[PDB]
Motif scaffolding. Structure first.
Motif, PDB file in Angstrom:
ATOM      1  N   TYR A 155      -8.561  -5.570   5.157  1.00 58.46           N
ATOM      2  CA  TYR A 155      -7.646  -4.637   4.512  1.00 58.46           C
ATOM      3  C   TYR A 155      -6.414  -5.401   4.019  1.00 58.46           C
ATOM      4  O   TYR A 155      -5.974  -5.199   2.887  1.00 58.46           O
TER       5      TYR A 155
ATOM      6  N   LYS B 227      -5.338  -6.010   0.187  1.00 52.80           N
ATOM      7  CA  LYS B 227      -4.023  -5.589  -0.270  1.00 52.80           C
ATOM      8  C   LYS B 227      -3.268  -6.774  -0.880  1.00 52.80           C
ATOM      9  O   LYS B 227      -2.490  -6.571  -1.816  1.00 52.80           O
TER      10      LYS B 227
ATOM     11  N   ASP C 101       0.829  -1.200   0.000  1.00 50.87           N
ATOM     12  CA  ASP C 101       0.000   0.000   0.000  1.00 50.87           C
ATOM     13  C   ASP C 101       0.866   1.254   0.000  1.00 50.87           C
ATOM     14  O   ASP C 101       1.272   1.723   1.060  1.00 50.87           O
TER      15      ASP C 101
END
Length: 276
Positions: free
Chosen positions: A202, A206, A185
């Motif tokens: 998350y 990712k 990220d």
């Protein structure tokens, strides 16, 4: 006498101070590397690699967050080394003895580490030895940058079954910034020392090639939680899990320490092992 300018102010220290007090474990491992006699440290929680210093050979001046100010008054230190965990206590410590802030600037990790280690060299008459140990760490860095190429990574800290993330310029940004590991990220900008709280969703979204994991609970509590946390439905399907690229960084260095000649060397070795 030496005049030292640091992030928090300025200190005045005799060269070759005899009564050295250390609240930063990176500095402690540097002094150990250089064979510099240490008087005291917080012994409530000591990194495994530094358990020499958990001994009665050394005076116990409390915990990382709570110094024993009385026992410090009994020593009257020639120097007190502190870093981030004690920055908020700068003024109280400064009252007892010469106090030097020696944390790293995460936005300029290498330059700040280099400056910090050269100050230690100057203070103890170990200048050329430090210069050579920095070069040897640089040899690690240049090799790891090549192994790091094209491997998207995420850095997480786990505690209590939950997670936070770190990226470029953060406490653990050296993985990206110094060792040239690409960030899964790139828009993750973190300055919280405890990381950005995130979900497993998350991490899954990712879907990093590599997942660097730092188990807080292994060191703060005496109970590893990282493998349980990671053994979870959303993480088990990641590239990182399927490809055997979950890298359990040793929290005795990463969480409790960092920024020393030994810890930075060992931290890079742990990354390299994970990338191999």
């Amino acid at each position: 006498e030496m005049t030292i300018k640091h992030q928090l102010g300025e200190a005045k220290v005799k060269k070759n101070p005899e009564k050295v007090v250390v609240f930063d474990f990176g500095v402690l491992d540097t002094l150990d590397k250089l064979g510099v006699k240490v008087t005291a440290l917080p012994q409530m929680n000591v990194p495994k690699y530094l358990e020499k210093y958990k001994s009665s050979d050394y005076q116990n001046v409390g915990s990382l967050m709570e110094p024993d100010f009385e026992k410090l008054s009994e020593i009257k230190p020639d120097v007190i080394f502190i870093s981030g965990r004690q920055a908020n206590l700068y003024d109280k410590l400064k009252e007892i003895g010469p106090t030097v802030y020696i944390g790293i600037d995460t936005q300029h990790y290498w330059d700040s580490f280099t400056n910090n280690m050269k100050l230690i060299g100057q203070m103890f008459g170990k200048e050329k030895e430090v210069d050579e140990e920095l070069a040897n760490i640089e040899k690690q860095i240049e090799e790891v940058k090549t192994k790091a190429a094209d491997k998207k990574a995420l850095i997480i800290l786990t505690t209590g079954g939950k997670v936070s993330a770190y990226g470029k310029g953060s406490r653990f940004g050296l993985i990206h910034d110094v060792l040239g590991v690409p960030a899964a990220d790139p828009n993750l900008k973190v300055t919280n020392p405890h990381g950005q709280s995130v979900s497993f969703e998350y991490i899954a979204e990712k879907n990093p090639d590599y997942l660097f994991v730092i188990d807080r609970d292994a060191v703060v509590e005496g109970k590893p939680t990282a493998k349980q946390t990671i053994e979870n439905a959303l993480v088990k399907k990641t590239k990182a899990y399927q490809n055997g690229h979950i890298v359990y960084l040793d929290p005795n260095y990463w969480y409790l320490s960092g920024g020393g000649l030994t810890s930075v060397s060992e931290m890079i070795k742990q990354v390299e092992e994970g990338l191999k």
